Design a protein around this ligand. Sequence first.
Ligand code: HEM
Ligand code: CA
Ligand code: CA
Length: 317
Amino acid sequence: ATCDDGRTTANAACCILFPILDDIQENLFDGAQCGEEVHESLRLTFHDAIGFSPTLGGGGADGSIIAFDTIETNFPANAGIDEIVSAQKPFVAKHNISAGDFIQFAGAVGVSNCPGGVRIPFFLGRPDAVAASPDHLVPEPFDSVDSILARMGDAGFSPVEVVWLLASHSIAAADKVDPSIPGTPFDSTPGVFDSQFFIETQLKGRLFPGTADNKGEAQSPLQGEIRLQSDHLLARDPQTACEWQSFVNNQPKIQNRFAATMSKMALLGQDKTKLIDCSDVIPTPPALVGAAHLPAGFSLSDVEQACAATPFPALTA
Ligand code: HEM
Ligand SMILES: [Ca+2]
Ligand SMILES: [Ca+2]
């Protein structure tokens, strides 16, 4: 189909997305940058979608975190999410897509601005949310591996798929974990969707980048980096460690797994056969240019190798 401005998409119902695309690139993502707003919108896709529990309810990826923000932003795990909820809500009011569609569309458009990134499959037509998420469904950085895996498992994600989704932390920072140092990233390249997160989490903890007593925070291997206790443990746990290491210097696998598992997450609570495929509306991400590396001056002796099956790859630094 050819839309009114002459841009093309496989399914005509998708044409309504193009003015929305233009609006968010300019006015949500500050001229299509891979910065804070993109990172925040990617975090939002998960805090919306993970509100899904067979036994308790919640409609998963349904826009409930905006529609019922009064409720959901009261949950402690949603700390700091109010900012991006407030930024996104006028876009939803202005345009004519559901909040659930908008959150996933904005997260996919956002990721597409990041070098190394992917086009996450995107489906149009989610109905408005009809219920708030139950409380206590969002993993916390101070939860054990067992508890995180059980929560993620309850929502339909195997332990490997939890590792796959956590590629998100390659383009990510913390403001609330240590409020003395807001915007400290999880990896050395928060504007690049790459394997640095999986490399650098495997390093020995050395210091705290701000204060030393924060709940959910592990020692970081670098002054300019923050480490979550959850990432620290998952990189090291027998359940997830070999999969975590499998991503190191393996950008093709990161791309494939992250796109597929993000699509599954975007569709929690939904039925893709009732929706319209609009994946071709997502912009083409830039590619990587620079090779995966240990931080300069670090070596293999700094890595806490946790995969018995396979030695940590030999990377230069
Ligand atoms: C599975 C267990 C997870 C835990 C314990 C966890 C924990 C966290 C924490 C503590 C922060 C920092 C919040 C702050 O202090 O500002 C964060 C940020 C972030 N999270 Fe995760 N997360 C998990 C999974 C995910 C998943 C599955 C996604 C996929 C979309 C994701 C995407 C992000 C992104 C992109 C940020 C950066 C936000 C920003 O820079 O504005 N996380 N997460
Ligand atoms: Ca939801
Ligand atoms: Ca990165």
